[model samples]
Target: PRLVGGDIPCSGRVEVQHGDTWGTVCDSDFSLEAASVLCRELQCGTVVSLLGGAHFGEGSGQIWAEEFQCEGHESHLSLCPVAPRPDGTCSHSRDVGVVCS
Candidate 1:
């Protein structure tokens, strides 16, 4: 996982690596819990802010349709179980992002 199009480090669009390619995630699939997981992975603090639905701008490649099931205390987002949104219901216009301090 990585942050893209963010003005600051460890903050912005949440993109995950799948099939060896990076892609943005749909906002509906992301949440505060997921943000905390990613923040920890990024070596940052808890969520300081949130940006949803392409607030960080659109991304290239596939728009990831996965939901992160973080238990609110994890060292990395990768450790969280990632599940699909299904049916290609997600679009890039709803890309999710987070700001971790």
Candidate 2:
């Protein structure tokens, strides 16, 4: 996954790579903890902020229709607990975003 659509390299909308396609993560349950993991993963420094509801603008393609529960200290996002969306409902308007320091 990578961050895009921001003025700086460390800030922007979140996109996750799935197979050969890229998708966006819904901000439903995204938090600072998850943002922290993302920052570390991307070597983008500590998280300055986590913007939800597509604060950076809408994304195209798939929307990761799930909720994430990060403990705020996970070494990686894959280590965080992810809950499936019962109805797999989401849209570009709910894309998650991050700003790193």
Most lDDT-accurate candidate? 2
How many clashing residue pairs appear in each of the predictions shown? Answer: 0, 0
List clashing residue pairs in candidate 1. Answer: none
Superposition error at 78 for model 1 (Å): 1.9
Residue-level lDDT for 74 in candidate 2? 79
Name every residue pair that clashes in candidate 2. none
lDDT of 2 by residue, 52-85 (tens): 8888898999877665677877777778898876
Model 1, 10-101: lDDT tens digits are 78888888777887888877778888888888887788877876888977778766678888787877788878785667767888888899
Choose the strongest candidate by TM-score. 1
> Worst ten-residue run, lDDT, model 1?
82-91
Distance from true position, residue 63, model 2, in Å?
A: 0.6
Candidate 1 global lDDT: 0.81
